[PDB]
Design a protein around this nucleic acid. Structure first.
Ligand SMILES: [Mg+2]
Ligand SMILES: [Mg+2]
Ligand SMILES: [Mg+2]
Ligand SMILES: [Mg+2]
Ligand SMILES: [Mg+2]
Ligand SMILES: [Mg+2]
Ligand SMILES: [Mg+2]
Ligand SMILES: [Mg+2]
Ligand SMILES: [Mg+2]
Ligand SMILES: [Mg+2]
Ligand SMILES: [Mg+2]
Ligand SMILES: [Mg+2]
Ligand SMILES: [Mg+2]
Ligand SMILES: [Mg+2]
Ligand SMILES: [Mg+2]
Ligand SMILES: [Mg+2]
Ligand SMILES: [Mg+2]
Ligand SMILES: [Mg+2]
Ligand SMILES: [Mg+2]
Ligand SMILES: [Mg+2]
Ligand SMILES: [Mg+2]
Ligand SMILES: [Mg+2]
Ligand SMILES: [Mg+2]
Ligand SMILES: [Mg+2]
Ligand SMILES: [Mg+2]
Ligand SMILES: [Mg+2]
Ligand SMILES: [Mg+2]
Ligand SMILES: [Mg+2]
Ligand SMILES: [Mg+2]
Ligand SMILES: [Mg+2]
Ligand SMILES: [Mg+2]
Ligand SMILES: [Mg+2]
Ligand SMILES: [Mg+2]
Ligand SMILES: [Mg+2]
Ligand SMILES: [Mg+2]
Ligand SMILES: [Mg+2]
Ligand SMILES: [Mg+2]
Ligand SMILES: [Mg+2]
Ligand SMILES: [Mg+2]
Ligand SMILES: [Mg+2]
Ligand SMILES: [Mg+2]
Ligand SMILES: [Mg+2]
Ligand SMILES: [Mg+2]
Ligand SMILES: [Mg+2]
Ligand SMILES: [Mg+2]
Ligand SMILES: [Mg+2]
Ligand SMILES: [Mg+2]
Ligand SMILES: [Mg+2]
Ligand SMILES: [Mg+2]
Ligand SMILES: [Mg+2]
Ligand SMILES: [Mg+2]
Ligand SMILES: [Mg+2]
Ligand SMILES: [Mg+2]
Ligand SMILES: [Mg+2]
Ligand SMILES: [Mg+2]
Ligand SMILES: [Mg+2]
Ligand SMILES: [Mg+2]
Ligand SMILES: [Mg+2]
Ligand SMILES: [Mg+2]
Ligand SMILES: [Mg+2]
Ligand SMILES: [Mg+2]
Ligand SMILES: [Mg+2]
Ligand SMILES: [Mg+2]
Ligand SMILES: [Mg+2]
Ligand SMILES: [Mg+2]
Ligand SMILES: [Mg+2]
Ligand SMILES: [Mg+2]
Ligand SMILES: [Mg+2]
Ligand SMILES: [Mg+2]
Ligand SMILES: [Mg+2]
Ligand SMILES: [Mg+2]
Ligand SMILES: [Mg+2]
Ligand SMILES: [Mg+2]
Ligand SMILES: [Mg+2]
Ligand SMILES: [Mg+2]
Ligand SMILES: [Mg+2]
Ligand SMILES: [Mg+2]
Ligand SMILES: [Mg+2]
Ligand SMILES: [Mg+2]
Ligand SMILES: [Mg+2]
Ligand SMILES: [Mg+2]
Ligand SMILES: [Mg+2]
Ligand SMILES: [Mg+2]
Ligand SMILES: [Mg+2]
Ligand SMILES: [Mg+2]
Ligand SMILES: [Mg+2]
Ligand SMILES: [Mg+2]
Ligand SMILES: [Mg+2]
Ligand SMILES: [Mg+2]
Ligand SMILES: [Mg+2]
Ligand SMILES: [Mg+2]
Ligand SMILES: [Mg+2]
Ligand SMILES: [Mg+2]
Ligand SMILES: [Mg+2]
Ligand SMILES: [Mg+2]
Ligand SMILES: [Mg+2]
Ligand SMILES: [Mg+2]
Ligand SMILES: [Mg+2]
Ligand SMILES: [Mg+2]
Ligand SMILES: [Mg+2]
Ligand SMILES: [Mg+2]
Ligand SMILES: [Mg+2]
Ligand SMILES: [Mg+2]
Ligand SMILES: [Mg+2]
Ligand SMILES: [Mg+2]
Ligand SMILES: [Mg+2]
Ligand SMILES: [Mg+2]
Ligand SMILES: [Mg+2]
Ligand SMILES: [Mg+2]
Ligand SMILES: [Mg+2]
Ligand SMILES: [Mg+2]
Ligand SMILES: [Mg+2]
Ligand SMILES: [Mg+2]
Ligand SMILES: [Mg+2]
Ligand SMILES: [Mg+2]
Lengths: 50, 143, 23
RNA sequence: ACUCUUAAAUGUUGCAAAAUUUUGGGAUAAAUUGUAAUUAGGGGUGAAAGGCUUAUCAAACUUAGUUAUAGCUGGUUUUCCACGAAACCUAUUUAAGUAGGGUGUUAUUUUUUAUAAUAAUUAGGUUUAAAUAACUAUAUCUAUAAUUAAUUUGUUAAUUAUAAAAUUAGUAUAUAAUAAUUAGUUAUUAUUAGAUAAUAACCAGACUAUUAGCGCUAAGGUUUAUAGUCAAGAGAGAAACAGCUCAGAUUAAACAAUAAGGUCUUUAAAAAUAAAUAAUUAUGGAGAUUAUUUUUGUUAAUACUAAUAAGAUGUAGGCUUGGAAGCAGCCAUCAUUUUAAAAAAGCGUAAAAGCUUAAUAUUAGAUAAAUUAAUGUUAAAAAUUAAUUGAUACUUAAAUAAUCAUAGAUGAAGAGAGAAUAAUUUUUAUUUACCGAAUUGAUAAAUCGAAAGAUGGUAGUGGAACGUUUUGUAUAAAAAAAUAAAAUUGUGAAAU
RNA sequence: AAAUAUUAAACCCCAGUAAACGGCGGCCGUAACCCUGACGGUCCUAAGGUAGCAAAAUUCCUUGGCGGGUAAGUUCCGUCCUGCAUGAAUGGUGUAACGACUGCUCUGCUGUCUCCAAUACUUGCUCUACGAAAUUGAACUUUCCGUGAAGAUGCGGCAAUAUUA
RNA sequence: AGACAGUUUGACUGGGGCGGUCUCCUCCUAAAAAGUAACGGAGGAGUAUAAUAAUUUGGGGUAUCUUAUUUUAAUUGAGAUCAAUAUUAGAAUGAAUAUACUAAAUUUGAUUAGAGUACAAACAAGUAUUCUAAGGAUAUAUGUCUGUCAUAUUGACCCGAUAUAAUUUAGUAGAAAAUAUAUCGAUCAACGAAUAAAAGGUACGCUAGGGAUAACAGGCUUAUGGGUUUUGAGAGUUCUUAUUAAUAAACCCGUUUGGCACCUCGAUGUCGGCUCAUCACAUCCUGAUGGUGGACAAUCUAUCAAGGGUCCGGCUGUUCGCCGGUUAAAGUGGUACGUGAGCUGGGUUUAAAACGUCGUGAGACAGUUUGGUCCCUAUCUGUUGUAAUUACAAGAAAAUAAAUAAGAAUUAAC
């Protein structure tokens, strides 16, 4: 059913024809998934100094 | 974005769907430093949580120092817009709710001048556990 | 509501005859 | 009675194209009803609901214009041989349509303005970048020239500005400068097309790899770019699979070597030599436990382990405090006695008391092992530098391996099933070999072609044929039809 | 050929018409306590919602607030008033009688229900005579999970069934 | 005189509609040739000007900072500095520095005619300009000039019009008229422009098509949602973890609000209730146990655990929810938010009618209110029950075991 999340095996050389799996997993060395429920901070002219 | 008129102008910037950069780290001002070890969106609360604990280290009562301890160079770069709940796609771009800093791989978050080696290792480990990011601590001694 | 769009067409600029060619 | 039909059940291809049964309204009146007749299609009639007008009414029925029109749906009848697309651009009361370009086929011509590969070569301004011109922010230095307060004003103390010099981070719409590849032209080699004419189909695209823009850098999402495959394409491997890999099928037929893949059994095909794991073994998270291996150094023979003991004093330090006695908090971190013992690294108290570590002793057990480089031979009741590896403890820490890290709803459901403790089986590394496609080579035939070799194919173009009806050939010759079965020939429709 | 002068109905201007249609305000401050606002000014309008009724067949916030009835009531009755978006022949208010009209309540009554049982006929089942209907790719027609044009009797994988009525 | 009639009443679009846009210019997107889309991000244009134009001439090079000067500078002098700033008519990019800015003298090249290549390019359209001829300006000219530094600064054809370098045949000659060279007139802005000439309603509705395109449901996603886990601001006498938990973080599930628009548009479906059920466990009670700021009791928290059990009633269309009363407890959810070829049809989505509001009007409403029609004989699967035929061991009449499966009521006052 979920042809999206069918992971490719050996003979399927790193790719299925309708999978969105391998393209997700390349992003966990330069991307992290953020959140809404954080503190609102809106001043781009903020000073990070102590 | 555009740094010319920050407050006046309304600002938008492209999300960068795969942005990766490495910048060769090296100390300039001081002895020891903390450096990041992964491309990441560095929030502000990632700093303000452990802001006091640096003052307790670098600054103390009844002691005067002429030279400077900390050198920070952090500025905001990414507006991070978003849509509402029941809104279809199209019909334009979303609106703002926050601001962030997109940092590269090897980024000098902090540069220190004669600060207690024993505490910063105790700090950066706790820093990295809240954040779950890889961070490092470096000193001219070990190098 | 969007007020944007309205770009123009590209203009066929650049070099048409390169070095060594016949003229 | 008659007339109408409120309410329910039944019935719903029923007894009935609106009824039966029970109940109920009006019942001398704006009543009910028979006979015959009038009013007629955007008009009739209407105590008005868009109702009725022969079961048909937001405009009847019948015939006729009329074979109404349809950029729409549904459909388009026998065979063989060759070649072989598109789902892009530009315009459109246009977006499921159409037109031209682009791609396809055929034909013609003393016909290359062509495709691929290699190499040389030219511009560029993505990218690169301990680069920094700009924007946003920013750390330092200094000649020189000056200041302020105070009677320690022939001193002391604290300070300011500045030429030259000068750091650092960031960015879609930041770059003086500067990559590879792509692209243009030229040459070389190899293929075989190119140009013109006559003319059809397409103009809803899908996925994957790389790359970007909107989006929760969510969606089998949506829109562009560069290749590939489906589309228009079977066979083998992926448990089963339009889009991933291998590969590109003329047809035939009980030969062999191979491609991705796979070799315990199911399942066709192999074993050897070394090692990892012991978990009902695949299959993964922040992070935790255990084990192993490797590593840093201002460390150290009183190493380390165990048993017993000790862990003190000036001192309740000074101050503060309702109290502060080593240990709320502030300043200080001195000194002595000891073989050693912190104005204490901690627990503890209302404050005291009391407990434990660091530092340490007695006794026993017990680790300290291997090396490199120098001034030829003369100092000495005597003394040797620089340096490594390794055993142990403290210390810096990381890595590898296994285990755990909760799970949904018809039934193990993950891992194709079962099993297997590495002995022909999971995993890792060397070695030698095999099975395995419609691939390739070998054999036979057909068609194009001198020959080598070519022949998948949708829309779609072109070529070659079968069968049926009619007429003439026929002023000639004669039963050749139809139905069923079998046989025979043909690449086949079919024929005899 | 063109132009000027002469002029009708109609149109404009003007007047009239509101049981024709239609329409009906706000700001400032003011009284032994804020708030309240008889009043007084203030700006505007053609005029400023008068009488009366009012959570209504009209109320978005709303199961509005209080009371009544019920062991307990979003509905019902009565009542108050920010009437979101009441209002006078699109008629306002009230009203005895009449209603196969709509909403709420009471007594009585009872298989509606707690809780369903027994009985009669019909229908039905068996034999017999007669004999329809829409439908229907073919059919030797199994469960589960997985699979996939995305919810499988039909593919894959472990299995089930002596055969049929 | 809509009294009557014949007709129009745009398109794109992440359903459609409301809203916004529709042509042209510049950058980013754009991935070092050119090109490259999106209801992607931003800004601009529908002009100006007879000198802001053409040829010569002069001046300081501009700009930034400091300083001195018969206190004055057409535009003083000197010195240092400037990855090319200052500017260059207006947006942005690009480029120039013999630029640009400034002063001045002569002047109209912002003229006419004819031939042709190249870029670009479906078409049409648009662009740069050399060469030849006439007739001029400038003034050593030897030469330079066919509007402005550049790119946008607009509109086809038809019809018609003013001035005219040329021709004429509706019998002939003229008039009339047509055409030709130069030239003017449109927010035809839906900007390739279908007409000179154009708005709405349909709950009375019809037909052709579409899952190319929406609402319920399935499927993918899981921002949101719920839950586990790590960290531990702050309460808890002290004290982070008896209890509690902000913030930050790593995964899971697929019950909510939603995004997309893959299946179904060639007879059906919406919530709720009656009857009937089945499954999970992330368990409300019962049962076992650890911990406790646990004396006992009552209670709080966590783990293991699915055997059996889990209320009636009033108001509402109602799940829910409030209320009254109780119980050992009155569980969270999935199954086309289970169950309409098994029942109901009260709500909501047709036709009638009314009030309020909007609207000239037809009429409309994520407002209210009264009323209000879809049907079925079960072929197969599946299932509750009942038999027939046949087989096995020689044939037959009877009695049993074995094996597997199914089933089993919970609670507890006193
Ligand atoms: Mg565009
Ligand atoms: Mg452009
Ligand atoms: Mg009667
Ligand atoms: Mg009566
Ligand atoms: Mg009566
Ligand atoms: Mg009506
Ligand atoms: Mg009738
Ligand atoms: Mg009609
Ligand atoms: Mg005709
Ligand atoms: Mg027509
Ligand atoms: Mg071919
Ligand atoms: Mg294509
Ligand atoms: Mg048009
Ligand atoms: Mg169409
Ligand atoms: Mg064509
Ligand atoms: Mg062609
Ligand atoms: Mg450059
Ligand atoms: Mg540098
Ligand atoms: Mg940098
Ligand atoms: Mg860039
Ligand atoms: Mg089209
Ligand atoms: Mg298209
Ligand atoms: Mg496409
Ligand atoms: Mg498309
Ligand atoms: Mg995607
Ligand atoms: Mg897609
Ligand atoms: Mg799509
Ligand atoms: Mg294939
Ligand atoms: Mg296959
Ligand atoms: Mg291939
Ligand atoms: Mg072959
Ligand atoms: Mg072989
Ligand atoms: Mg075998
Ligand atoms: Mg881990
Ligand atoms: Mg002791
Ligand atoms: Mg003492
Ligand atoms: Mg004291
Ligand atoms: Mg003390
Ligand atoms: Mg203490
Ligand atoms: Mg104390
Ligand atoms: Mg002491
Ligand atoms: Mg072994
Ligand atoms: Mg072995
Ligand atoms: Mg061969
Ligand atoms: Mg072939
Ligand atoms: Mg062929
Ligand atoms: Mg009125
Ligand atoms: Mg009043
Ligand atoms: Mg009420
Ligand atoms: Mg009440
Ligand atoms: Mg009332
Ligand atoms: Mg009114
Ligand atoms: Mg009224
Ligand atoms: Mg009146
Ligand atoms: Mg009326
Ligand atoms: Mg009335
Ligand atoms: Mg009344
Ligand atoms: Mg009355
Ligand atoms: Mg009545
Ligand atoms: Mg009422
Ligand atoms: Mg009973
Ligand atoms: Mg069968
Ligand atoms: Mg299935
Ligand atoms: Mg198969
Ligand atoms: Mg099967
Ligand atoms: Mg009309
Ligand atoms: Mg008219
Ligand atoms: Mg017509
Ligand atoms: Mg449309
Ligand atoms: Mg839409
Ligand atoms: Mg380019
Ligand atoms: Mg890029
Ligand atoms: Mg395109
Ligand atoms: Mg504009
Ligand atoms: Mg100028
Ligand atoms: Mg000059
Ligand atoms: Mg000067
Ligand atoms: Mg200009
Ligand atoms: Mg400019
Ligand atoms: Mg001119
Ligand atoms: Mg060209
Ligand atoms: Mg052209
Ligand atoms: Mg131009
Ligand atoms: Mg010029
Ligand atoms: Mg025209
Ligand atoms: Mg004549
Ligand atoms: Mg004449
Ligand atoms: Mg027009
Ligand atoms: Mg148009
Ligand atoms: Mg157009
Ligand atoms: Mg165009
Ligand atoms: Mg109506
Ligand atoms: Mg229809
Ligand atoms: Mg849905
Ligand atoms: Mg998921
Ligand atoms: Mg979330
Ligand atoms: Mg506390
Ligand atoms: Mg705390
Ligand atoms: Mg679809
Ligand atoms: Mg479906
Ligand atoms: Mg249809
Ligand atoms: Mg059907
Ligand atoms: Mg459990
Ligand atoms: Mg249960
Ligand atoms: Mg039991
Ligand atoms: Mg009652
Ligand atoms: Mg009720
Ligand atoms: Mg209760
Ligand atoms: Mg449904
Ligand atoms: Mg349901
Ligand atoms: Mg059903
Ligand atoms: Mg009105
Ligand atoms: Mg009634
Ligand atoms: Mg049957
Ligand atoms: Mg069946």
């Amino acid at each position: 059913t979920n042809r999206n999340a069918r992971p490719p095996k050996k003979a399927n050389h790193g790719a299925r024809p309708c999978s969105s799996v391998m393209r997700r997993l390349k992003k966990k060395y330069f991307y992290r998934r953020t959140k809404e429920a954080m503190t609102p901070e809106m001043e781009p002219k903020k000073k990070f100094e102590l | 974005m555009r740094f010319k008129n920050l407050s006046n102008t309304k600002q938008v910037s492209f999300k960068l769907r795969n942005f990766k950069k490495t910048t060769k780290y090296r100390l300039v001002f001081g002895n020891s430093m903390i450096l990041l070890y992964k491309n990441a969106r560095f929030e502000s609360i990632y700093f303000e949580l452990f802001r006091k604990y640096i003052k307790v280290i670098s600054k103390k009562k009844n002691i005067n120092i002429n030279y400077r301890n900390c050198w920070i160079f952090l500025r905001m770069n990414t507006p991070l817009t978003k849509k509402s709940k029941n809104s279809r796609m199209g019909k334009g771009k979303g609106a703002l709710y926050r601001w962030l800093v997109r940092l590269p791989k090897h980024y000098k978050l902090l540069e220190f001048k004669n600060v207690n080696y024993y505490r910063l290792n105790f700090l950066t480990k706790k820093w990295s556990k809240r954040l779950s990011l890889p961070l490092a601590f470096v000193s001219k001694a070990n190098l | 509501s969007t007020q944007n769009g309205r770009d123009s067409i590209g203009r066929r600029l650049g070099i048409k005859k390169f070095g060594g060619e016949e003229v």
